[PDB]
Amino acid sequence: QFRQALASEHDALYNDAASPRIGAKDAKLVLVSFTDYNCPYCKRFDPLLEKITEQYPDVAVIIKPLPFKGESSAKASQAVLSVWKEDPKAFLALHQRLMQKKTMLDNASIEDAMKSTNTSKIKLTDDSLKTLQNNLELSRKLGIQGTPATVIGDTILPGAVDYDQLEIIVKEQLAK
Secondary structure, eight states, rough: OOHHHHHHHHHHHHOOTOOOOESSSSSSSEEEEEOOOOHHHHHHHHHHHHHHHHHOOEEEEEEEOOSSSHHHHHHHHHHHHHHHOOOOGHHHHHHHHHHHSOOOOOOHHHHHHHHHHTTSSSSSSSSSHHHHHHHHHHHHHHHOOOSEEETTTTTOOOOOHHHHHHHHHHHHHTTT
16 A cells, blocks of 8 residues: 555646646656755755755656644745746745745744745735645655655655765666
């Protein structure tokens, strides 16, 4: 009930237009990053996921924000998803800024991040919460109970690893 769930959730994982993507549209390997903007391990792990896409252009990353850590997690998710829907090219800078914030986010922090990334004119939509609902449903089906969690091929990486190990994992999934 795993490679079965992974197969059953293929479209939700890889083919949701409302889910932000980092890296090439023609990638041979797409990582799916279930992440939380208030999770300290996500803050550690995210820049490694991004580095992968910059170092290895055959790898892309899909971002699935989850709101597990706190209420502002849901609000931050709402912000980046709204930005992706309206201006996909503006998403990355906001995503990075929210991820590197040392403090637990709140509405002020999130509004400030959007101001300094030139995304503050983009309105937080109700429709983007439906994407957040989809991410939550998806997390349940796959048995994801914590962040970060990364789908890489036919396996799920349920925590954070260092870059050397991520390279290793990513390289053999490419070897198939």
